[PDB]
Write a protein that binds this ligand. Sequence first.
Ligand SMILES: [Ca+2]
Ligand SMILES: [Zn+2]
Length: 391
Amino acid sequence: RANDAPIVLLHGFTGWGREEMFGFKYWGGVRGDIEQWLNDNGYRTYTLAVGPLSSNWDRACEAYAQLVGGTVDYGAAHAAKHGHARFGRTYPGLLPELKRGGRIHIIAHSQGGQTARMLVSLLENGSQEEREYAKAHNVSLSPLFEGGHHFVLSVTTIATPHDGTTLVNMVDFTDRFFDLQKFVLKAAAVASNVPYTSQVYDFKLDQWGLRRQPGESFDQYFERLKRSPVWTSTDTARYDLSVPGAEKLNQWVKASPNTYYLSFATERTYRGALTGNYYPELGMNAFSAVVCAPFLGSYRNATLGIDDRWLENDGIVNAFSMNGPKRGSTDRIVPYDGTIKKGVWNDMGTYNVDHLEVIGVDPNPLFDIRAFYLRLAEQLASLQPHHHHHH
Ligand SMILES: [Ca+2]
Ligand SMILES: [Zn+2]
């Protein structure tokens, strides 16, 4: 143990707070409670919950406020550009200590990894556009946009589409994506054709002024979201998840030299006998198996750059996209050699588990999830806050 930094957990295009889904955890799912496990083992751990469908930017803003406390500030320039609210939900702050020189490890899953990267970039570099806009229009400016924060010792990504996922190319992606949401609700024993009066799954679309109404089931709510700016505008997860969107995000979201980055790739497919195509293995979550993997494993696009290396997948994301950003990126990626190097992506390899199995939302008895996270935690705790140069 070289550091006492707490661990913070962060979800992707699906996810919810510890008090949502009747307690079914995004981090653990049918297997348990990952956060609890870490805590019980001596690793202080917290959980962030942000908009699942929102843009990484929105998410980052939300994360910052959820960490330090206060009212979400999306940036005047940003809000005016995308025509959504500047200020959002107020949070009590999970870790005030950050504002006193404390540091955290972020463990992110899926799109959460893009969000984590973005958060570190904003914390350290702020946003020039925001600074300049504040100065020309005489509006206040969130600390998040000034730069100079050192809050993050490390970022670990699991099954993150750093270069996007081809899933979004599906002609029917709109319908299937939401079907995936319903699937996850199903996993938690929640029906989508029911108007639960209870919260259940808050998409936190405060900036857009959207929320499930009384008498409105998720099926009906999603129909509405599909036609809303959270689905039709570039300031969305849908955009950032795409290959072009991810590359655009990679053009400015760089690895900080002061933070350690670890990536974990996932794969649950096999290569066909007479084709470079990939197919879903036995055990893969039912949804992905039928609806997503076949596409991910057979889809190519030369103009875009999507070739045979992109076909191996975890049912939702292309494994090629997971070791770290590459398209439009200046970041470096190094295969793990037994030493975790700072300011670069330490590619920890590929694990044989699906997008949902990795977090416990889909079962997989052959995957010792408790040990995986515990080992991870142990590794993060061994990170030195000062690496001495040596032979
Ligand atoms: Ca399984
Ligand atoms: Zn936004």
